[PDB]
Symmetry: D2
Subunit: 386 residues, 4 copies
């Protein structure tokens, strides 16, 4: 009954189940979790693996000696459990030095420091077997218009990613980068605020093939955008390297609810798309168990993430396999959308009088699209009423 | 006192001052304007030129004979007034045949018709001297998730733009295309919903150099995004071919208020950017005089568009020229943002112990950014309190 | 299998299935429906009744003679089908004379006309058996700040509702009024924009017992508000006289999707509340079949409204009846929320040292609320995974 | 030049200039301020007074002995500077015990504790001379639908406010309560989310005359609502007891920018309303100097709050005094909005054939409202172009 196994490739950040519940108006409600005990509990729940920021694993300020001991203990828990580490990332947002950004801070010495801190963790990520390195530029942005010349900031952002790409290629590392967009919070506006802006930026990097996106459900919904549409555009471009799954109720602060909460129908269409496009990367949950919960609620919330994915996967598969839905898709001409508009070419199109001079515009306009019947079949499948 | 002249390059759509005031809940409050009388009145107000959809100028269904007579009359008013036509576009949204889109309609015959209707107007646009051809895909999108496979739709959208690019290059026309994004309305979600998504899509076209964006103030604000930031990214990419100026009060239906209404501080930062980057295209107003107004209010609203641009231009220029602001910009290290992070290169950065091992992270963190003083100087300039 | 009957009290506006599909950017895609044929088709689908604006039933400008003939034909279709008319309302928004409002128009003669037009329809509503008269002040509001002094406008709004209350009481009519809030569209901001503002306003009317609210799902969601919470406050105040059911995807133009579309989990919690509070008024659908659809899609969309209500009713009932959920509700102390904080009174509370001096604040803080387990049981019930 | 004096009644929370800059993603960037040094610095800037939560002034957990010493030191700084304390409030949101609310927590013992903690601070507030006691129920709400039965929660909220009203009346205190609404953050949805919901709730309390609202600019804008309209409704009801002034850029997390930032035109219309209605309470700034700033930026930001209020006051006064604006207001019939619709009474209205049978609906509809000219005069005044 909807039991996950490591083959489902569900992964969790250390910072998710480990969130202590500090919010802008309140103190922590839970004690800190040892990363080793998070790895063990997640493995018992059926997770495939974990992800980390450098500072989740190695306390900021650690000596190289304490650093080695933190990595060894972590490594041992991975060996004991069979858990993988498919992704890692850098914390360039918590320490006060990053208050105006890391890669795009106005102070040049901070930008250099941000790069060195990142490169140090790329080495560790490769040693732990990560295939994707995520960058979330949470402090890159501004609260006021004169504080940041955005063209100069984009030059500095390109410079930083180009240097990271030079570093990995000169070291011979098999790791790719994924940029995680977010429109706002904690800065008033964040640079590269949506999937689209990140995809466009990547095309100006020196080695674009090294870079993709790590979209997050709740972040695109903070701009009121359709998250499955944005994922479709990222798949179309060949750039969906990783994904952050969670829930969000509309345009407000980043809630990071468990996956399936928030916009449930969008979650259904997302799962339908990922499974039908054969996305084979990790199903990563970037979520926060609400601070109302004790540790039992933390693990219940994490389990719910995986459960809801598997229920939606079953419902989406039943939807696509239903002969009545396949009939309705043809009734709505989804088959015709997949056929070229003009494989006969420009000149044939220009000479084709059925395309314009003799086109019966009133008869075409009268044809219903039958989209409402199709959408009710999708609702019936989602609710198990079929 | 803030008087426009044709050298300011202010342009207006025929559909703007000509909007009759039909909204989803109400009938027209104004009679239709003859395009010839709009051209004359706009020239008296100091406009540089006008833009049109095919169907604003030539009533849908016109015979080639009536078509010639409509163009001749229009041509004569342009000659009489000195007005230019820098941009034109196609109406692929009003007629019922476009109810599921033009370029991405599920029905293949509608997509072919949409292309032929577009190509016919490109010829007319070139004959009238337009340099930019805008495409706003207002019906390309969906209200429900199963109605549109977005990857197939993006294939059809790329196919259509590629064919248009083949057409203009084979005819030898000097015209470029600009895609106008909008996140929603009239479809539940529109494809290419923001500047970012449009910029990313262009990079997958066969001849990307022919295509740029035509962002609109209110459209990016319907997603809660920072419009000057989005324009900065479009300028950074070399893709700001045209711009639609208006006002919008937040995330709601597309209001198309006169420019300067809505988010006034964003209008100030937009003008500052366009003038400081030397944008030399038309300052185009895509706005709707509210349906409360009679014809005197229509022309007052149009005049207000231009007036507010010129006032903000003066205030932004005074801001940038003020020695006290230039001092504050250095206090906030805007000069350092413009300098390379690591022109010394990767290996020098890796060897530079001042970048990491000996970097004083507490001293850097203690430095204030002085952004609030800078932003109050900007407020004082905007309000004329300096 | 989820078949409606007239005992479910599902009702529809004539303007819903009769929407021709004109939107701000496009012409009608469907022909006009005769009200008699809407009544017949809705009765076949299992509806209980229909509602109308005056101008849906009697074309604006009709002579008293044509008016009688329109009502007679309508009356005959009601008799033929058994359909009821539980609610009626006035169109004070379509005609250009209402461009600045009806009850709060700046012109006094328009306000008087608006009142006479309303009173004429109240008489007709009573004759057809309506129990509720709805007022949606769609044009009451402003696009700019100086156009409307809101205190004077609220005086005029109170004056109008007070006069309507004097009219019904002096005629001896058994009808109550319900105000339908909406935050914006078609005006930039609409007066009384949410359930809360309408409830507060009612308390200042001369006979508050005659007035309640008619909230609409999509309207409160256009302000990002939680619609079941707002309904709970209206029930708490005793003011939920009627309700408009539909769907909305977030903060954007008013979509009026079929009920169950949009925010599905909010629809589940709404149905749970209405059924558990014993709301006994009509389940009214104020929705628009998308303009992509032909007439077959119109009736499919209407049928889907009722179907989704009945599926959610079944799932909510199963949720509340599940012993495991009843256990979880006690685990989360919902039982304790229903018990008085201090039935012992103020002085006892002040003397109770267990409430403060000896209260163990760390032990209380450590208690988890178990809300995530409860919410996953609700998800499992909604999806039929229980 | 826009210099504040204590007669302008500008006040600040201790928690505003004292915000250390901890946000959900980052550590504090500033050291803690001693309340005594905040009082001194604010008095030098021209403030009238300060406000406090209990826990800003007395560290949570203090013994009665340390409590007396904290109050004495504070009292001495007030005497030294002449600063007043017009408002106080309770912190019912930071400590983990309040994670599910204070007055509406599901656990009954927490609700009792919340009341005792509040009553203790009401005594202190009265002793320091406060006239208004604010309640912001920041934790009253829910992230999921089953966690909170909102009708029971509103019963508990009414019970708590009724008890507080019984307490102040039995002690003979001259203090009134003001409820501060907020739609969300830190809870997913907060109870009483807007001005309207709070006004409606007050009317169900046992002694409604003791309770009003404390609206905050940014909070109503987090729901996309028009803040001057909401203030107008609160003034109309006689309930504007206090106000929180700040800035917000649209629908996102609560930014608490300095007043004048965010929506500048809304700030202008707010000041116009407060000054023209003769609001005589404190002008209170609930704002957070951004965490980019050091202490010099903190005081610059605070000074900017007051400066922008005084500039807008001057511009609004010039607008209303301008004969050309007074003419335009009559052109737009603002004078007619202020006149009764039907002071002649219902029967006269029903007999008045000029109101309906002989009303010329086409001639009334043709009249323009001249709102765009009026709004451009308002823009010219705001920008100092008049
Ligand atoms: Mg997030
Ligand atoms: Mg994430
Ligand atoms: Mg627009
Ligand atoms: Mg436009
Ligand atoms: Mg609606
Ligand atoms: Mg409605
Ligand atoms: Mg706030
Ligand atoms: Mg506040």
């Amino acid at each position: 009954n909807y039991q996950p196994t490591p083959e489902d490739r569900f992964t969790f950040g250390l910072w998710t189940v480990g969130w202590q519940g500090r919010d802008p108006f309140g103190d922590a409600t839970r004690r800190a979790l040892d990363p080793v005990e998070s790895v063990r509990r997640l493995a018992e729940l059926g997770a495939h693996g974990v992800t980390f920021h450098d500072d989740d694993l190695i306390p900021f300020g650690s000596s190289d000696s304490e650093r080695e001991e933190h990595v060894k203990r972590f490594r041992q828990a991975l060996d004991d459990t069979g858990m993988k580490v498919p992704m890692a990332t850098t914390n360039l947002f918590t320490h006060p030095v990053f208050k105006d950004g890391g890669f795009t801070a106005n102070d040049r010495d901070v930008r250099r420091y941000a790069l060195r801190k990142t490169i140090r963790n790329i080495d560790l990520a490769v040693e732990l077997g990560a295939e994707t390195y995520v960058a979330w530029g949470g402090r890159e942005g501004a609260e006021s218009g004169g504080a940041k010349d955005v063209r100069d900031a984009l030059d500095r952002m390109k410079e930083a990613f180009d240097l990271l790409g030079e570093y990995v290629t000169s070291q011979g590392y098999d790791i790719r980068f994924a940029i995680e967009p977010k429109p706002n919070e904690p800065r008033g506006d964040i640079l590269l605020p949506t999937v689209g802006h990140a995809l466009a930026f990547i095309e100006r990097l020196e080695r674009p093939e090294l870079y993709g996106v790590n979209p997050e459900v709740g972040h695109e919904q903070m701009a009121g955008l359709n998250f499955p549409h944005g994922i479709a555009q990222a798949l179309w471009a060949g750039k969906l390297f990783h994904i952050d799954l969670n829930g969000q109720n509309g345009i407000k602060y980043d809630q990071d609810l468990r996956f399936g909460a928030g916009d449930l129908r969008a979650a259904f269409w997302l799962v339908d798309l990922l499974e039908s496009a054969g996305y084979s990367g990790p199903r990563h949950f970037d979520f926060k168990p609400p601070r109302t919960e004790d540790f039992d609620g933390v693990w219940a919330s994490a389990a719910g993430c995986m459960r809801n994915y598997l229920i939606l996967k079953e419902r989406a598969a039943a939807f696509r396999a239903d002969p009545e839905v396949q009939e309705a898709l043809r009734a709505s001409r989804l088959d015709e959308l997949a056929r070229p508009t003009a494989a006969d070419g420009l000149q044939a199109l220009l000479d084709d009088r059925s395309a314009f001079e003799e086109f019966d515009v009133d008869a075409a306009a009268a044809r219903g699209m039958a989209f409402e019947r199709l959408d009710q079949l999708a609702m019936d499948h989602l609710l198990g009423a079929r």
